[PDB]
Amino acid sequence: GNPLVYLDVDANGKPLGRVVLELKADVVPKTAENFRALCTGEKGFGYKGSTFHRVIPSFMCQAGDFTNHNGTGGKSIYGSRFPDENFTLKHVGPGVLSMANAGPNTNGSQFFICTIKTDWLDGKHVVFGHVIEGMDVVKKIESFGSKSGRTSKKIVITDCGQLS
Ligand SMILES: *[Se]c1ccccc1C(=O)Nc1ccccc1
């Protein structure tokens, strides 16, 4: 069974609700396992308490920098970075979960929820899951973004974990 995980998200302390994600461990087991463990916090670090630090309406929500909270940090459960597992899953449309990176083989903990179908990102970012429930929460996060990515409220993953 592919893991189901959740992120409960706040905007300036007001609960926005829950995003439920399926991690495609059947396709990208190593990338799925990293995200799953960062959600449970079982390695002693992870996403709880961290933020969506970059949000661009009509494009994406970006999160996972739980060390520096600004896009420069994060780390994987394996070490600071780990390779691109494969590019089998594509950026097919809204709700896609994709690893952020700084070029080939630099996956860490940062990730995007992508709202756009684009062949240009295929083969550059590892896709590893999708939104099962809560796309309305994603659009509320989106509502607090801006062209630059700066958010107008502090968007916080107040709790996260594994459902199954
Ligand atoms: Se969508 C997506 C998925 C994976 C990586 C990056 C993106 C993305 O939309 N990036 C971006 C879009 C618009 C402006 C800045 C950055």
Residue pair 122/46 in contact (Cβ under 8 Å)? The answer is: no
What does CATH list as the number for 1-164? 2.40.100.10
34 backbone dihedrals φ, ψ, rounded to 5°:
-60, -55
Indicate the domain borders of the chain.
1-164
Q: What is the resolution of this structure in A?
A: 1.6
Distance CA 104, CA 156 (A): 28
Method used experimentally: X-ray
Burial of residue 164, with CB atoms counted within 10 A of its CB: 0-12 exposed, 13-18 middle, 19 or more buried: exposed
Residue of 155, 130, 149, 25 lying closest to 85 (CA atoms): 25
| Residues whose beta carbon lies within 6 Å of some atom of ligand 1 | 56, 59-60, 91, 98, 112, 114, 116, 121, 125
Q: Active-site residue 128, yes or no?
A: no
DSSP string, 34-52: HHHHHHHTTTS--STT-BE
